[PDB]
Amino acid sequence: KWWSAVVEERDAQSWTISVTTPADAVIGHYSLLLQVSGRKQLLLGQFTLLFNPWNREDAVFLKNEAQRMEYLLNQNGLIYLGTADCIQAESWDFGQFEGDVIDLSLRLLSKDKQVEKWSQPVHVARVLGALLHFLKEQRVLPTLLNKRRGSVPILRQWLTGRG
Amino acid sequence: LHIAAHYENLNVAQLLLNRGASVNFTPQNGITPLHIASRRGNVIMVRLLLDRGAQIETKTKDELTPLHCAARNGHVRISEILLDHGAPIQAKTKNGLSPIHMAAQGDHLDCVRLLLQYDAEIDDITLDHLTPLHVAAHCGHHRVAKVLLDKGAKPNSRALNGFTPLHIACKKNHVRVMELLLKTGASIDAVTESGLTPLHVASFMGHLPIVKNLLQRGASPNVSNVKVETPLHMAARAGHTEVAKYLLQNKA
Amino acid sequence: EELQDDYEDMMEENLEQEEYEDPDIPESQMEE
Amino acid sequence: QMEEPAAHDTEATATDYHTTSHPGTHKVYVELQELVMDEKNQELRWMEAARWVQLEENLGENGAWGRPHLSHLTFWSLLELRRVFTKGTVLLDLQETSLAGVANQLLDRFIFEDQIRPQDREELLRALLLKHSHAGELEALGGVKPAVLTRS
Amino acid sequence: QILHPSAGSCDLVPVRAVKEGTLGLTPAVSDLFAAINASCVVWKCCEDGTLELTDSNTKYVGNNISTKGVGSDRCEDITQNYKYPEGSLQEKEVLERVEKEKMERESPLYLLLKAPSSLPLRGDAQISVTLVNHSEQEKAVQLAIGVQAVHYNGVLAAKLWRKKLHLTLSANLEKIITIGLFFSNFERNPPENTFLRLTAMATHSESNLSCFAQEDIAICRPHLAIKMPEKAEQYQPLTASVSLQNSLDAPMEDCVISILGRGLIHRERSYRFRSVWPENTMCAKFQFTPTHVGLQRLTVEVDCNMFQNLTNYKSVTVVAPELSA
């Protein structure tokens, strides 16, 4: 349930180690380090820890696999515009799995200094919403200008300022 | 397997099905694992059960097909999967409700759209001769009523007691359904088997805004029942001072 | 607690067998 | 299918596909393969000719690599490289993980940029997806000979 | 949970809190509840400077609350998660409780406006104004009709058309007036991403009460039809057909069509096609090779001088190649 490591398969020169993380772990970039007794700490690599809608003990757990796919894994979304009596569906590319989106999101979250609360989805969501509203207020200019290619270029232009 | 379908625990469900579990195990209540998977919204579990050989026309003790369970909860994907596998879209329960009745009862707009896309009877009647438009008027779902009316549902359909969807909309203080029906050609002066006009029902129930709208649209307060009673009589017999006052001010 | 789902009554409540039945036909006759 | 549209050649939204990630730095290994044909079966395939490990080693017609040396270039090679790079086709930050996908995207961009004709796409896809042999299987065959891809 | 920024700080509000009117659970419950439960009062502005109240149609708020459906491209309506049905007992109880908490903390003329849901771009529409006189004497009414362009956030953009009918209404008689809403009669072209605010105002005698009605009319652009096979094999060429019929009154010039999609096309490819005269159909054929297995989407955007950023989509499931030797 907590942090743990166990050797599932082993050879003379290799260990196959299964590593678990707590269901309420702090998200962000992690460094995995190995310590040998009477030896200096050694860095094994880097990994990023995210919320788990598939884990029942997690706060973001979803019952349905279809709901999980639609609300997390689907990068092709639909934003509905128009009027109530004439709804025009607009194809939108969320692109949450673009290579730089995770790094940009974590760098934006790093503005909050309450890193111990980053394990709580509520605090992370509120901080991200406030920061993104601030970025929208600072970056959106008064009035192709209306040509959109998804949320990723908008996020890049809001954070870096280029685009 | 019922528990696995309820929680969509795919791994243990596959293990049980490989060990020899009955995919169509029917208890005394008639609730198959396919019924639970359809009701709970478990799309992947529904697909797994259909792949393993679940019967799609099985009825519960209330004769509810899995299509009924999917439609009453608004699971559009499960309903589409069942219809593609051969689910009967005109299956009726013990009360005569079709899956479109279940979808209209729950304000499931996209499920109603999907069912109408699969050649569902838009004016299917229950044992009380209630069309899906009647159900939408009773429940106040004006969006479902609009979708039904735009595809050809009769606005003046008659129930057992001669009640139109306009009558039921005026009875339950559902003003938006009344406006949509009157836009789509519902008869404002239609009478029931007892001669009850929508103004009669609205005055008896005390729904002042509906009475005001009907009188503004030209409804005559001089209409009479089988007892010759006017809407003023209905308002006076139920102690609705405001409705009676407005009726007196308009033409009585 | 966190183990009520292992009992018959709580599991029966969770499965919601009443949701698989047709409750009634709403008529609501206006006559007093 | 009434009209086959021509390329607009506009980069109005080019900046929308520019990633903010910082690329890393590596001393890289470069491998050169030439479309050749074998002698035992007269089948055209890809065989490695030289490799770069910051020093150039060449593969002779005996199955063994030559001695390492600095890379030296002719005037005509660099002139033609500049000529074909000036009007070249670039697919930067391409989301592909297979040779078939890279070849398909490259041929689609070739057709879009009028580099090749649409009738040549099938032949080029056949050529780019041929078996890539190496020095280990050179002796297994009858050797390698220079080859030119034909219309058929 | 609803992310509601406050000008600042952000708050997470449960949807059931908004639906049940639990004003006090989170600080942003009140604003979200008011966003979908407020009532509109319409005041007439006179040349004398008097702001006068108008009999008005009920302008419902919080309508057709929509989001993308699960497992399909269909539209899912989630208004029932936010609001009880109008005129029901639960909605009445919630409204009365909210009003009580807020309070503790602190004619013979009828107009019926019938308008189409959308007006085709550079097209024609017919609107109907129904005037019913409930008086015993004939009335001289002044029917004022105005069309104005509004942005998505309610900001006025440009006045487009206006009409002032003078009608005589017989006593106890219903009159239906049909008015042709024509794009060519607009004083200026509506700005992009705007909506039509159709208003009908009726003033009679010296009663000081004006009947007012308003409707929101969208602008309907020509349909961008995409023809593509439902199933496609990975690493094999796929052909997509794009059809667009020019229903406008002017030829389409500077015509550019662009295609894009994740797992189908690297970035986007923009194409130029010939000018399309009115009542002509543009047919464009695109060949591309899918390279990623799964449910992919092809997005097609068409730009011209008449309209810009006209986008349509179609979904194709890419399957892995058949196993062989």
Side-chain angles (χ1 to χ4, degrees), chain A residues 1-142 144-163, chain B, chain C residues 3 6-17 19-23 26 30, chain D residues 3-8 12-21 23-24 26 28-152, chain E residues 1-5 7-325:
Chain A
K1 314 299 295 182
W2 197 69
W3 296 90
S4 64
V6 62
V7 177
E8 305 282 354
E9 179 59 272
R10 51 194 180 95
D11 301 326
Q13 305 242 29
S14 61
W15 286 357
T16 301
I17 304 178
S18 179
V19 182
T20 45
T21 55
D24 57 331
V26 176
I27 67 169
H29 301 291
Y30 273 84
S31 299
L32 187 57
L33 297 141
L34 171 63
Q35 290 104 314
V36 181
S37 59
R39 203 179 65 91
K40 203 188 64 178
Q41 194 178 37
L42 176 60
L43 176 60
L44 299 183
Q46 315 286 349
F47 65 97
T48 303
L49 197 51
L50 307 176
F51 294 106
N52 200 340
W54 289 260
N55 188 26
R56 190 176 62 180
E57 291 81 5
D58 201 321
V60 294
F61 174 64
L62 279 169
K63 296 180 296 298
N64 288 345
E65 179 66 30
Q67 289 191 33
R68 281 189 290 262
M69 294 186 301
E70 174 59 39
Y71 297 136
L72 210 73
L73 303 180
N74 187 24
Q75 299 182 85
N76 297 330
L78 294 177
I79 313 302
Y80 296 92
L81 311 180
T83 58
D85 299 321
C86 182
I87 302 179
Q88 300 130 203
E90 201 87 315
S91 63
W92 190 268
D93 172 65
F94 287 114
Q96 67 274 20
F97 297 144
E98 187 71 22
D100 64 329
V101 167
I102 168 67
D103 300 331
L104 285 174
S105 300
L106 286 181
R107 177 149 23 93
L108 182 61
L109 180 61
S110 65
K111 274 74 181 179
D112 173 68
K113 262 56 187 176
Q114 304 174 90
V115 296
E116 65 279 352
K117 295 182 178 180
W118 289 9
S119 61
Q120 307 171 9
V122 178
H123 173 80
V124 176
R126 289 212 284 253
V127 166
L128 289 173
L131 291 175
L132 285 172
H133 185 81
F134 178 79
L135 291 175
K136 191 219 67 176
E137 290 292 333
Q138 255 52 48
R139 297 294 189 180
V140 170
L141 307 179
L144 294 175
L145 309 184
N146 296 271
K147 188 177 298 299
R148 299 271 66 85
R149 284 298 181 265
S151 302
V152 184
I154 304 180
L155 184 63
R156 291 171 181 172
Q157 197 274 337
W158 285 4
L159 285 168
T160 62
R162 306 177 301 270
Chain B
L1 185 57
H2 288 77
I3 310 300
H6 179 86
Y7 294 97
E8 204 181 2
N9 296 328
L10 297 168
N11 300 328
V12 69
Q14 290 179 42
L15 176 62
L16 290 175
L17 289 163
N18 293 330
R19 294 301 173 88
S22 180
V23 71
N24 289 290
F25 191 90
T26 327
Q28 216 286 146
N29 50 17
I31 306 177
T32 60
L34 183 57
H35 282 86
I36 305 185
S38 301
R39 208 274 302 180
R40 287 284 294 184
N42 310 329
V43 180
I44 315 296
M45 181 62 64
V46 158
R47 282 195 166 275
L48 171 64
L49 293 179
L50 288 181
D51 291 359
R52 298 309 292 265
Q55 300 177 8
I56 207 174
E57 66 279 65
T58 313
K59 304 172 179 297
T60 63
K61 69 173 184 299
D62 287 67
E63 300 205 16
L64 261 80
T65 60
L67 187 56
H68 288 96
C69 303
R72 70 184 311 178
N73 290 90
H75 305 309
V76 182
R77 190 68 183 101
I78 293 191
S79 300
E80 185 177 5
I81 290 177
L82 294 177
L83 287 173
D84 293 331
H85 280 69
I89 205 175
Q90 298 299 139
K92 312 179 72 64
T93 65
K94 59 119 153 57
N95 294 330
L97 274 75
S98 52
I100 188 177
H101 289 97
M102 298 289 186
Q105 232 165 11
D107 201 5
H108 307 299
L109 196 55
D110 199 55
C111 193
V112 171
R113 294 199 191 101
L114 179 77
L115 289 170
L116 289 172
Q117 187 178 347
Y118 277 81
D119 301 359
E121 293 180 349
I122 201 173
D123 286 326
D124 187 69
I125 55 176
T126 62
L127 295 185
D128 301 1
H129 288 56
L130 293 182
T131 59
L133 189 59
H134 284 100
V135 180
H138 180 65
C139 298
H141 306 154
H142 59 273
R143 298 174 291 271
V144 180
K146 184 170 186 176
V147 155
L148 291 171
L149 285 170
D150 290 1
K151 288 192 177 60
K154 298 183 271 72
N156 292 327
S157 301
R158 298 290 183 174
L160 281 183
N161 3 88
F163 278 76
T164 56
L166 185 58
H167 288 124
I168 313 184
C170 294
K171 185 175 183 299
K172 308 293 294 183
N173 201 20
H174 294 142
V175 53
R176 304 195 67 175
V177 183
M178 174 200 67
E179 298 170 359
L180 259 162
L181 288 167
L182 289 169
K183 177 188 295 183
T184 337
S187 300
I188 195 180
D189 301 328
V191 297
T192 65
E193 301 279 52
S194 300
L196 290 165
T197 56
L199 189 56
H200 273 125
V201 187
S203 300
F204 179 68
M205 294 301 299
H207 303 328
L208 183 61
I210 292 194
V211 175
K212 182 187 303 298
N213 205 329
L214 290 179
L215 290 183
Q216 283 179 334
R217 294 175 106 95
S220 180
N222 301 331
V223 294
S224 298
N225 225 32
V226 288
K227 304 291 187 60
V228 100
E229 301 176 357
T230 59
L232 183 58
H233 289 83
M234 312 283 284
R237 214 182 83 262
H240 299 302
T241 306
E242 304 173 6
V243 178
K245 182 178 179 60
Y246 201 69
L247 288 169
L248 289 169
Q249 288 182 233
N250 277 255
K251 268 300 174 296
Chain C
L3 287 177
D6 305 1
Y7 296 90
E8 296 280 352
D9 297 359
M10 182 58 60
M11 181 55 62
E12 182 180 0
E13 289 285 342
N14 292 329
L15 287 161
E16 297 182 355
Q17 306 164 190
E19 298 289 338
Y20 303 90
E21 321 175 27
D22 201 330
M30 201 207 61
Chain D
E3 174 179 16
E4 300 308 277
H8 186 204
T13 54
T15 60
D16 291 3
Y17 303 95
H18 293 172
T19 177
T20 59
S21 297
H26 328 264
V28 294
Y29 158 81
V30 189
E31 180 180 351
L32 171 60
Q33 297 184 353
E34 185 179 4
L35 181 59
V36 302
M37 63 187 305
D38 50 68
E39 186 66 28
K40 50 126 57 182
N41 295 337
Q42 308 294 333
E43 179 182 0
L44 64 157
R45 54 172 55 187
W46 295 95
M47 171 66 67
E48 51 177 0
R51 59 186 178 183
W52 279 257
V53 207
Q54 234 296 141
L55 222 55
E56 180 180 356
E57 299 181 350
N58 301 90
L59 183 62
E61 300 84 4
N62 54 88
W65 296 87
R67 78 183 87 104
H69 65 92
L70 246 188
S71 299
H72 312 116
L73 312 179
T74 68
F75 182 85
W76 301 111
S77 62
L78 278 182
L79 183 137
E80 190 60 36
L81 179 59
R82 176 182 178 268
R83 185 185 305 271
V84 302
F85 221 149
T86 306
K87 57 186 302 299
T89 282
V90 284
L91 295 184
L92 308 185
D93 56 281
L94 177 61
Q95 269 83 358
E96 293 290 339
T97 179
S98 178
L99 183 59
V102 174
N104 289 323
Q105 295 293 334
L106 243 190
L107 291 186
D108 290 1
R109 195 67 87 89
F110 282 167
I111 297 183
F112 180 77
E113 296 184 2
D114 298 70
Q115 292 276 44
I116 67 177
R117 295 171 296 184
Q119 48 176 350
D120 309 357
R121 189 192 187 276
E122 197 275 341
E123 294 86 328
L124 290 191
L125 188 56
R126 166 66 180 180
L128 290 179
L129 295 188
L130 291 171
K131 189 63 179 60
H132 290 256
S133 295
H134 299 267
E137 45 271 8
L138 227 181
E139 297 183 0
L141 305 178
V144 289
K145 320 292 294 183
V148 175
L149 181 64
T150 339
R151 192 70 210 181
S152 60
Chain E
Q1 318 293 328
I2 307 172
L3 289 85
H4 182 250
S9 180
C10 182
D11 189 12
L12 281 185
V13 185
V15 187
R16 194 172 65 93
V18 181
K19 179 178 178 178
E20 299 181 1
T22 315
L23 273 66
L25 185 73
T26 93
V29 176
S30 181
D31 290 3
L32 288 182
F33 184 83
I36 58 179
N37 294 277
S39 56
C40 176
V41 181
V42 179
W43 304 88
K44 179 176 62 180
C45 297
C46 303
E47 290 79 11
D48 213 317
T50 314
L51 253 37
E52 295 224 359
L53 202 130
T54 215
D55 194 66
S56 57
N57 66 290
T58 301
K59 183 178 182 178
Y60 302 96
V61 299
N63 308 324
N64 297 115
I65 299 182
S66 301
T67 185
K68 183 181 179 300
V70 176
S72 63
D73 298 324
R74 310 179 61 88
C75 182
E76 189 73 19
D77 202 313
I78 55 175
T79 312
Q80 57 177 161
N81 302 132
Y82 284 76
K83 286 153 57 64
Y84 295 103
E86 285 81 6
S88 58
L89 267 61
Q90 303 90 323
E91 184 239 14
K92 187 243 191 184
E93 177 266 329
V94 168
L95 260 297
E96 283 188 329
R97 174 168 44 87
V98 169
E99 282 291 294
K100 186 184 63 178
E101 194 272 343
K102 276 177 153 54
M103 219 63 177
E104 289 182 348
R105 191 216 77 262
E106 184 181 10
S107 181
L109 187 63
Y110 174 72
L111 206 159
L112 181 58
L113 176 63
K114 186 224 66 181
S117 60
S118 59
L119 165 59
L121 181 63
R122 305 304 301 180
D124 303 327
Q126 296 293 335
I127 65 177
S128 178
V129 177
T130 296
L131 294 179
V132 189
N133 184 22
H134 286 52
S135 181
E136 293 288 339
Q137 48 188 345
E138 65 177 11
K139 210 162 298 300
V141 71
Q142 176 191 359
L143 182 59
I145 302 178
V147 180
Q148 195 171 0
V150 293
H151 294 287
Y152 93 102
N153 60 338
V155 176
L156 287 312
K159 299 178 179 60
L160 304 181
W161 188 57
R162 64 192 68 186
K163 190 89 171 186
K164 186 176 300 302
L165 293 322
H166 290 74
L167 308 167
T168 55
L169 286 163
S170 302
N172 307 274
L173 186 59
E174 178 190 18
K175 178 179 177 58
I176 295 181
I177 307 100
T178 302
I179 301 94
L181 181 57
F182 299 150
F183 238 90
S184 59
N185 292 340
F186 291 160
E187 299 167 7
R188 62 205 77 262
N189 285 326
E192 36 78 26
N193 307 333
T194 55
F195 304 92
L196 303 193
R197 177 62 57 84
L198 173 65
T199 57
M201 179 173 295
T203 302
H204 62 268
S205 68
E206 215 268 323
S207 177
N208 249 9
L209 188 58
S210 213
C211 294
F212 172 95
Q214 55 176 326
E215 289 294 331
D216 297 330
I217 305 179
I219 297 181
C220 183
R221 295 190 293 186
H223 174 255
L224 189 59
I226 303 176
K227 187 173 301 301
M228 183 169 54
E230 210 79 9
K231 288 293 183 299
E233 184 181 356
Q234 191 190 22
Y235 304 145
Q236 298 296 331
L238 181 64
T239 313
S241 144
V242 174
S243 297
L244 179 64
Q245 201 274 347
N246 186 17
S247 58
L248 311 158
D249 52 354
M252 296 171 50
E253 302 292 333
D254 7 306
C255 287
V256 175
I257 181 171
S258 301
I259 50 178
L260 59 97
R262 188 176 302 272
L264 298 179
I265 303 174
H266 172 60
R267 299 189 175 188
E268 55 176 321
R269 300 195 239 102
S270 296
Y271 295 88
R272 300 172 65 93
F273 59 99
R274 299 176 301 267
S275 298
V276 188
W277 287 88
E279 310 302 321
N280 291 13
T281 301
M282 176 266 293
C283 300
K285 218 61 174 300
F286 306 99
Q287 191 186 60
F288 57 93
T289 301
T291 58
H292 297 71
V293 183
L295 177 63
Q296 319 292 344
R297 173 192 291 178
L298 172 67
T299 301
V300 177
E301 184 182 33
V302 172
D303 297 334
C304 67
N305 60 329
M306 303 300 299
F307 53 86
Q308 295 84 40
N309 306 291
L310 178 62
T311 62
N312 194 24
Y313 59 94
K314 196 177 188 303
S315 299
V316 49
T317 298
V318 182
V319 300
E322 193 74 19
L323 295 179
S324 60

